[PDB]
Amino acid sequence: NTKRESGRKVQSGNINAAKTIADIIRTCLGPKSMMKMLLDPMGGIVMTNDGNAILREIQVQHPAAKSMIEISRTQDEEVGDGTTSVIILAGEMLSVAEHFLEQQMHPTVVISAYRKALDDMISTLKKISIPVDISDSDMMLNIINSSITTKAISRWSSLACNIALDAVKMVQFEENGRKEIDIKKYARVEKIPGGIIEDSCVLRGVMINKDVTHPRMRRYIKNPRIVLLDSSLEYKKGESQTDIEITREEDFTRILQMEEEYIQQLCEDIIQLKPDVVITEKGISDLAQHYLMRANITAIRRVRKTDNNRIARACGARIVSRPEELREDDVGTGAGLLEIKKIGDEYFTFITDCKDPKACTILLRGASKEILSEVERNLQDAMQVCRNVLLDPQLVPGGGASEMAVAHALTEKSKAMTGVEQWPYRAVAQALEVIPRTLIQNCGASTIRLLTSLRAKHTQENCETWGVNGETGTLVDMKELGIWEPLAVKLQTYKTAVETAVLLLRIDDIVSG
Amino acid sequence: MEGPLSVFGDRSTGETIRSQNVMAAASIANIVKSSLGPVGLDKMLVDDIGDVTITNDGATILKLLEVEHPAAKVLCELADLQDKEVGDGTTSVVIIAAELLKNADELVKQKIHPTSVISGYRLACKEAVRYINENLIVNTDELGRDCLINAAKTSMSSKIIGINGDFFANMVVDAVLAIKYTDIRGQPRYPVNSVNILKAHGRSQMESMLISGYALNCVVGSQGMPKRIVNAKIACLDFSLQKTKMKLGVQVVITDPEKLDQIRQRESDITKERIQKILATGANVILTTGGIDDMCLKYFVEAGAMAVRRVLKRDLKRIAKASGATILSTLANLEGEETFEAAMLGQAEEVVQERICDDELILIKNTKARTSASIILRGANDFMCDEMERSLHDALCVVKRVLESKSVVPGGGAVEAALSIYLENYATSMGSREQLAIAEFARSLLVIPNTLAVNAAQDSTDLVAKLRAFHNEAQVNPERKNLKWIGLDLSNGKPRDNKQAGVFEPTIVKVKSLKFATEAAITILRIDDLIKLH
Amino acid sequence: MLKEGAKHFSGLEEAVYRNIQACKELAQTTRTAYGPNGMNKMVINHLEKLFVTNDAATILRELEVQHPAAKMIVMASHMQEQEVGDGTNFVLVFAGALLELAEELLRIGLSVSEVIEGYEIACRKAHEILPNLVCCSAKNLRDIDEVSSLLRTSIMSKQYGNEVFLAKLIAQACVSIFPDSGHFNVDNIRVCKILGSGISSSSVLHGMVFKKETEGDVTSVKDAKIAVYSCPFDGMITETKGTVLIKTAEELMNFSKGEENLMDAQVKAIADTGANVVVTGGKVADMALHYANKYNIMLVRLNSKWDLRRLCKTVGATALPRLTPPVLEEMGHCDSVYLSEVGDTQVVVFKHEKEDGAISTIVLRGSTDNLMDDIERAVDDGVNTFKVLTRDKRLVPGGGATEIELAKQITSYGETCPGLEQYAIKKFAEAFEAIPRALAENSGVKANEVISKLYAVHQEGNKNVGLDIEAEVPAVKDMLEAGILDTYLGKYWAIKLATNAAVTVLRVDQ
């Protein structure tokens, strides 16, 4: 209707909800960590390492309480890390720079400031980013065990170091670009209920829970053939559409079985033709699928063409309309390894597949049901470095120190930059140093004078390489110490944080509509 | 509202419903001011506690806004209808439209008779109509130092992300001049709609590869039929070959699965028979718009085939128009025994395909029905091309907007803030109530830059210091030349000497808003007899 | 603290808060002052002259506050005015802006045992290199534009436009008649207020200039025994009118008899006290007037303490009531005494010229005192700044043009040193911009714009803002090579003194 809201007050509204999120999960961040308690109106205990998890479970305000979920979900989609870091950078910087600058009267040179304090940030980061080798799971270790401990897991880290570090190398985009950096399709995280670390095998390919579900389904034909319909089955799973009337009671039942009978007559054709495998993408219900077990066939059902066709290239199968129909092998053997490791009688097919499009499902087993999701997040936190190291051998030792390396060198360039520019530059560059000094808080002692000396040490000796760690709160070489800050991480965590900054700096009104 | 609240419905009984409208007009204009243009900050528009949107557009917010005020009513449509006119003046009309209805009715009420004051907000706009149409002075892209090339460049160098204006000084020229098509607005104009431009991932972060003729979008790995034979001719096809289903449907009325596959397998082989006729006619390369499924791919992989399929119709359309081929001259059927025709042959010096960046395009060289170019934007990623392409389109558009009009007006209010004190002194010229009438508008050509440069935080009182530094008794002059720089470049907040940049707008978009400026004013007057409805 | 009892106005929160807060808020004057400004403060001490001021001293004279620091701190600011006239409108804002810099570090939790040190340490580092950034010096003090140049920051600092002739007038005053060998006097060279003429007509008439009327004659001899009397003539026994016509035709005479023959012996012993000039704090009776002329004694019909004070000061006088034959303990100082027309007003002029004890007196001509006082205020703070008693003023860049000079000195030195004081020292490199802002404020821009462009000049020494168009957009007025210059003396003080204030005021918890 007719309503007008204004600028810095709306900017403050952008400051407020975010400024709250900038705190606890910043404490929860890094080697000095916390938990965010959530009081349910009934009193239920909730504590996480993610405040957006707490936000989803409680009131969320239309201001950046909504957005700091969003842009962290944006941060959650990309590298799968730094969501904890984005919430605490953005609202902070927006709480830091704006007032100092808007009293000088401008978002304008602040508009330029975030990408300028991004510039050297991105710049000297890549420059002090230390090459760490891809060929070695050990020289991929110190970086990936650092990345999986950014969320504070060494538990399945080393095991995520085992499986995933070579797995993203086995992740291929079928565009034949990278590959090296991999979005999650060609690399997926999928788990098996229960199990054990040896029931976890390094699995670099797709894993179909539906390839072998049951023992009467296919058993170790090392190169199956996945039949999609078309002859061995057909394009009809239909309904004969029988006329109906109130006087015919048997007439209600015939139309019910008719959906299954066509599903049956296709599987009956499968009983006749008998592949080792059929993929039914229209899907087959329990009835006709119980008929494929007597034919010595697996029934792969209600999966997707993309996965199947990749599974085909992944497991050594291919789409052929009949088993008796034999045309040619697009993949004679497409498998690095074929496994089925069962928990209970329900079978789970592990097909280890090297540089296939596949799913690169990386088998992740907790000791039991519950910590599976740990191994999932860890093998996910794994593939982050795995796609970072393989893309970028350079990645900065740091994250206490890299956060220092950025901050102190930034305003250090104001010494070079100066101008009116320096003022919003440093002000958007101010908030960064505090992140380790926020963790150096829980190191006890003096969180300030340490970083102070470390800030001196920054340009004095070295910056992110030799610098502050959240574990130490003091100077160590983050390389020698083995604490690593993936290069792909810092390019993002700040970005989406400063992306929300200029935006919420530039969004000056909220209309009623 | 204000005034008596017990009679609803825009009876506030007196100027209370005039002022509550002008203060709403001012208020509804307060939305768009800080929204004005790109320097006008994006608003985050709450549509609900769970629904928002972020726009600085003047006509986007007000379509979403509710207005029960008559002056707030006329303001939303003016943002919208001038958007409906162009989209230049979504923001522009809004600011003064608050003022002129506030400026109009005041003297209209004073009447010697209300007819006198009506022109005062038309007359200066009319005197702006001439002045605006008197502008070739800034925005002219056709007159550069490099002409179109700098018209490209300066418009690229306005949105410049990079070497835009280096190789891209060439491209906007190349893009508009690769276009032979019948879309014309007024004077002859070449569509930037028909430009065939595709993205590169890798190699150069910024480069523009200029290739002769149209380059058809294509990819390797999605077709098992080898699609590549070097030749001088292509076959542009609106047509399909699919082994799964081409002429085939499904049967839910038939119980027998035998009935589906018996009519299915016939269509699989005739695809391999049809490719032979499309090939052997004239064409070693055959361009097919109809596709094949990834399953069907397997069928065309292991049964084999030849064709170039799944290719964009828009290109294959433009190619056959360019290359003298025909998109469909022959097939009324999908049959494999149906012969293919030689008119669909692309007339080209060669049929070649450059795969680069891991991105392949089908190059039709020397298209003989008309000239063409498909310019390949080199990014290291595909979204680098959009930053180019967004810089390109508006560069394309502003040149196309100079292809809209010869007379063209400067971006920014140095056009307005000139006539401002010109015509606010022209207030005095006629004097009387017209010095009131003419000034009320001509005082308001000051305010748009006061929004403009302040959206850049330049304190436009400093800009109008620079503006009316140009704006003189010695320079009253739109001319076609600058003894005063009438340009105000809105990517800055202060004038820049670019007249070819992409920020400027043609004379078409402005004289429109001049009506819209005066439109909020007298549209609300003609009513008589304010009443109350039970 | 934990008690219902005891006492404090400061502490805890308050020390961190209230002691920093209002002490800053005091700066609003000095935030708008010190350097060219049109901004002024109407301060009504209710005198029935409503006083325009930017001068902190007589702004803070009225201001009273419970904040023990702000209660105290005006001391160091007024202790400043004692030492230099200019730089005082600088004192309050600089530290005041430098204060909450520490309080922000207190929000960071940087200790009072810590932060102010770095200031103090950079207060050294300033006064370490502060004499190095001295450039010129005011050398010949008879010379106009060596004196008027120092004046051209100082009066300018107080007030802008009037400054130039004042600086001339003050240098044309030749406060160098005091050799400035270690000699300066505020009463001997004095301001003398004259209603009307011009303030460009406002002059320096050497001697003691009394706008009070010389009555009857002038002195018998120019080395007078100067009779300065509070009430030498109040009348002896006055005449009356009884009936709203006359009281009695008979009763008239006897009172003049007492009047005359007393005021005979009165003024005869004003002649027997050897008074060449009788200076009457009260009125005069026409009989004593007649007697003052016959006995040949210059008569001053009325005297304000402004006379009587300086009279007691200069002449060695004691202003006395007399119904009796007097004696002079006043004597004279003066080697010359006159009725001169100055301000084109008949004026009591006591006069002599020496190096020492020499009266060479400003005569200000203005329609009001608010004219002739705040301008005098603006004036005398340059006259006060003229008082150094190091003849060479060691003129630094004026107009605060040394701000940008020390600013990069302190911020580079703040980079050198480690530890929380490096911030405090870098915080000390900050409050420089206050007056450049105080200028840029009355000029109308932010110091950032100014100071960043003067961070672009880096080492400059000359360019600094003020009130002017040059001080707005260009961020530049040339305050070293100017005509506008300031001594190192007030530089030695204000940076240190405003610190000396800011030293313990956060420490004081009770």
> Which amino acid would we find at residue B342?
A
Q: Among residues A439, A483, A442, which one has the least CA distance to residue A464?
A: A483
Rounded CA separation B91/B32 (Å):
6
Name residue A337's beta-bridge partners. Answer: A352
Rounded CA separation B465/B451 (Å):
14
Rounded CA separation B185/B174 (Å):
20
Q: Do A448 and C452 touch (CB under 8 A)?
A: no
DSSP per-residue letters across C97-152: HHHHHHHHHHHTT--TTTHHHHHHHHHHHHHHHTTTT-------SSSHHHHHHHHH
Instruction: For CA atoms A249, A250, A251, A255, give the dihedral sign.
Output: positive
Instruction: For CA atoms A128, A133, A137, A139, give the dihedral sign.
Output: negative
Rounded CA separation C73/C69 (Å):
5
Q: Best residue in B32, B252, B262, B266 to probe A by mutation, most A CBs within 10 Å?
A: B252
Q: Is C254 on the interface with A (CB under 8 A)?
A: no
Shortest distance, CA B36 to any CA of chain A (angstroms) = 12
Q: Which residues of C are less than 8 Å from A104 in CB distance?
A: 446, 448
Q: Is C242 on the interface with A (CB under 8 A)?
A: no
Beta strands in A8-167 (DSSP E): 36-37, 47-48, 130-131
Q: What residues have CB less than 8 Å from A17, skipping those under 6 apart?
A: A61, A63, A64, A65, A66, A68, A91
Give the annotated binding-site residues of B: 37, 88-92, 158-159, 412, 505
Shortest distance, CA B42 to any CA of chain A (angstroms) = 5
Rounded CA separation A404/A400 (Å):
6
Q: Do C449 and A420 touch (CB under 8 A)?
A: yes
Q: What are the φ and ψ backbone dihedral angles of B308, each rounded to 5 degrees?
A: -105, 105
> Do residues B241 and B334 make contact, with C-beta atoms less than 8 angstroms apart?
yes
Q: Do A7 and B221 touch (CB under 8 A)?
A: no
Q: Best residue in A420, A441, A459 to probe C by mutation, most C CBs within 10 Å?
A: A420
DSSP character at residue B506: E
Q: Is A240 on the interface with B (CB under 8 A)?
A: yes
Rounded CA separation C449/C471 (Å):
10
Rounded CA separation C417/C408 (Å):
14
> Do residues C93 and C438 make contact, with C-beta atoms less than 8 angstroms apart?
yes
> Do residues B481 and B55 make contact, with C-beta atoms less than 8 angstroms apart?
no
> Do residues B226 and B286 make contact, with C-beta atoms less than 8 angstroms apart?
no
DSSP character at residue C456: H
- Of A231, A330, A503, Cβ closest to residue B301: A330
Rounded CA separation B119/B125 (Å):
9
Name residue C299's beta-bridge partners. Answer: C215, C278
Q: Best residue in A102, A423, A434 to probe C by mutation, most C CBs within 10 Å?
A: A423
Q: Which residues of A are less than 8 Å from B294 in CB distance?
A: 305-306, 309
> Which amino acid would we find at residue C160?
Y
Shortest distance, CA A448 to any CA of chain C (angstroms) = 8
DSSP character at residue B345: B
User: And the tokens for B360?
Assistant: 């392949």
Count how many residues are written for chain C: 510
Locate all alpha helices (DSSP H) within C353-446, ordered by sequence.
369-386, 403-416, 420-428, 434-443
DSSP per-residue letters across B50-95: TEEEEE--HHHHHHHS---SHHHHHHHHHHHHHHHHTSTTTTHHHH
> Do residues A482 and A142 make contact, with C-beta atoms less than 8 angstroms apart?
yes
Burial (CB count within 10 angstroms: exposed 0-12, middle 13-18, buried 19+), residue C238: exposed
Q: Is A261 strand, coil or helix?
A: helix
Per-residue burial over B168-203, b if 16 or more Cβ lie within 10 Å, else e, is: bbbbbbbbbebbbeeeeeeeebbbbebbbbbbbbbe
Q: What residues have CB less than 8 Å from B5, skipping those under 6 apart?
A: none
Instruction: For CA atoms B61, B63, B64, B66, give the dihedral sign.
Output: positive
Rounded CA separation B128/B486 (Å):
14
> Do residues A471 and A457 make contact, with C-beta atoms less than 8 angstroms apart?
no
Rounded CA separation B478/B462 (Å):
22
A-to-B residue pairs, Cβ atoms closer than 8 angstroms: 141
Please name the residues between 319 and 348 in chain A that touch chain B, using a CB distance below 8 Å. 319-321, 327-328, 330
> Do residues C21 and C69 make contact, with C-beta atoms less than 8 angstroms apart?
no
Give the annotated binding-site residues of C: 34-35, 86-90, 156-158, 399, 486, 491
Q: Which residues of A are less than 8 Å from C97 in CB distance?
A: none
Does the active-site annotation cover B57? yes
> Do residues A492 and A481 make contact, with C-beta atoms less than 8 angstroms apart?
no
Rounded CA separation A469/A31 (Å):
8
How many other C-beta atoms are found inside a 10 Å radius of the C-beta of residue B332? Answer: 7
Q: How far apart are the first and last CA of chain C?
A: 10
Q: Is C455 on the interface with A (CB under 8 A)?
A: yes
Rounded CA separation A383/A204 (Å):
11
Question: Active-site residue among B10, B60, B83, B90?
Answer: B90
Rounded CA separation C353/C361 (Å):
10
Q: Is A238 on the interface with B (CB under 8 A)?
A: yes
Locate all alpha helices (DSSP H) within A282-439, ordered by sequence.
286-290, 305-311, 372-391, 401-417, 422-430, 434-439
Please name the residues between 78 and 107 in chain A that touch chain B, using a CB distance below 8 Å. 105-107
Q: What are the φ and ψ backbone dihedral angles of B364, each rounded to 5 degrees?
A: -105, 105
Q: Do B260 and A235 touch (CB under 8 A)?
A: yes
Q: Which residues of B are less than 8 Å from A234 in CB distance?
A: 257, 260-261, 264
Q: Is A254 on the interface with B (CB under 8 A)?
A: no
Q: Is C448 on the interface with A (CB under 8 A)?
A: yes
**Element (H or E) spanning A299, and its range?**
strand A298-301
Instruction: For CA atoms C40, C41, C47, C49, give the dihedral sign.
Output: positive
Q: What is the dihedral of CA C441, C446, C452, C454, to 10 degrees?
A: -20
Give the annotated binding-site residues of A: 30, 81-85, 150-151, 399, 470-471, 485, 490
What's the gap between Cα C420 and its chain centre? Answer: 39
DSSP per-residue letters across C276-341: EEEEESS---HHHHHHHHHTT-EEES---HHHHHHIIIII-----B-SS----SS----SEEEEEE
Per-residue burial over A396-424, b if 16 or more Cβ lie within 10 Å, else e, is: bbbbbbbbbbbbbbbbbbbeebbebebbb
Q: Best residue in C453, C455, C457, C473 to probe A by mutation, most A CBs within 10 Å?
A: C455
Q: Do B64 and A265 touch (CB under 8 A)?
A: no
Q: What residues have CB less than 8 Å from A78, skipping those under 6 apart?
A: A492, A496
Give the Å distances, CA to CA, from C464 to A108, A296, C436, C437. 25, 93, 7, 10
Shortest distance, CA A107 to any CA of chain B (angstroms) = 8
- Of C419, C449, C455, Cβ closest to residue A449: C419
Rounded CA separation A416/A426 (Å):
12
Question: Which subunits have 3 or more CB–CB pairs within 8 Å of chain C?
Answer: A
Do β-strands C275-280 and C298-300 pair in parallel, antiparallel, or remain unpaired?
Answer: parallel
- Of B303, B358, B456, Cβ closest to residue A176: B358
Q: Do C422 and A418 touch (CB under 8 A)?
A: no
The technique is: cryo-EM
User: And the tokens for A111?
Assistant: 């508009």
Q: Which residues of A are less than 8 Å from B52 in CB distance?
A: 62, 66, 510
DSSP character at residue C360: E
Rounded CA separation A237/A260 (Å):
8
- Of A177, A306, A513, Cβ closest to residue B201: A177
> Which amino acid would we find at residue C394?
R
Closest chain C residue to A423 measured between Cα atoms?
C448
Rounded CA separation C152/C386 (Å):
11
How many other C-beta atoms are found inside a 10 Å radius of the C-beta of residue C117? Answer: 18
Question: Which subunits have 3 or more CB–CB pairs within 8 Å of chain B?
Answer: A
Q: Locate tokens 């944080």: which residue?
A: A497
Q: Best residue in C448, C450, C457 to probe A by mutation, most A CBs within 10 Å?
A: C448
Q: Among residues C322, C364, C312, C358, which one has the least CA distance to residue C343?
A: C364
Largest CA-CA distance found in chain C, in angstroms, rounded:
98
Question: Active-site residue among B60, B394, B507, B518?
Answer: B394
Helix axes C88-107, C144-158, angle to 10 degrees: 50
Rounded CA separation A226/A319 (Å):
5
Q: Among residues C186, C211, C161, C206, which one has the least CA distance to residue C374?
A: C161
> Which amino acid would we find at residue A388?
N
**Chain breaks of chain C after residues with C–N above 2.5 Å:** none
Q: Is C449 on the interface with A (CB under 8 A)?
A: yes
Q: What residues have CB less than 8 Å from A144, skipping those under 6 apart?
A: A157, A160, A161, A164, A165, A381, A382, A385, A386, A389
> Which amino acid would we find at residue A159?
L
Closest chain B residue to A240 measured between Cα atoms?
B253
Count how many residues are written for chain A: 513
SS3 of B246-301: CCCCCCCCCCCCHHHHHHHHHHHHHHHHHHHHHHHHHCCEEEECCCCCHHHHHHHH
Rounded CA separation A278/A296 (Å):
11
Give the Å distances, CA to CA, from B9 to A502, B69, B438, B526. 42, 9, 32, 17
HSE (CB half, 13 Å, CA atoms) of B506?
A: 20
Q: Is A100 strand, coil or helix?
A: helix
DSSP character at residue C264: H
Give the Å distances, CA to CA, from A28 to A31, A83, A90, A280, A474. 8, 12, 16, 47, 19
Please identify every residue of A annotated as catalytic.
50, 83-84, 381
Count how many residues are written for chain B: 534
Give the annotated binding-site residues of C for ADP: 34-35, 87-90, 156-158, 399, 486
Q: Do B31 and A305 touch (CB under 8 A)?
A: no
Rounded CA separation A145/C357 (Å):
88
Rounded CA separation B52/B43 (Å):
10
User: And the tokens for C166?
Assistant: 């004042």
**Element (H or E) spanning B119, and its range?**
helix B115-133
Do β-strands B359-365 and B373-379 pair in parallel, antiparallel, or remain unpaired?
Answer: unpaired
HSE (CB half, 13 Å, CA atoms) of A76?
A: 15
> Do residues C502 and C100 make contact, with C-beta atoms less than 8 angstroms apart?
no
Q: Locate tokens 């990623």: which residue?
A: B381
Shortest distance, CA A470 to any CA of chain B (angstroms) = 35
Q: Is C311 left (phi over 0), alpha (psi -120 to 50) or beta?
A: alpha
Q: Locate tokens 């964009």: which residue?
A: B312
Q: Is B454 strand, coil or helix?
A: helix
> Do residues B264 and B244 make contact, with C-beta atoms less than 8 angstroms apart?
yes
**Element (H or E) spanning B207, and its range?**
strand B207-212
How many other C-beta atoms are found inside a 10 Å radius of the C-beta of residue A311? Answer: 34
Q: Do B45 and A511 touch (CB under 8 A)?
A: yes
What's the gap between Cα C297 and its chain centre? Answer: 35
User: And the tokens for C114?
Assistant: 């810590």
Do β-strands C298-300 and C336-342 pair in parallel, antiparallel, or remain unpaired?
Answer: unpaired
Q: What residues have CB less than 8 Å from B64, skipping those under 6 apart?
A: A511, A513, B45, B47, B53
Rounded CA separation C166/C143 (Å):
14
Closest chain B residue to A66 measured between Cα atoms?
B50
**Element (H or E) spanning B404, and its range?**
none
**Element (H or E) spanning A265, and its range?**
helix A250-273
Q: Locate tokens 């060494």: which residue?
A: A154
Closest chain C residue to A437 measured between Cα atoms?
C108
Quote the radius of gyration of chain A (alpha carbons, Å). Answer: 28
Rounded CA separation A262/A260 (Å):
5
> Do residues B205 and B162 make contact, with C-beta atoms less than 8 angstroms apart?
yes
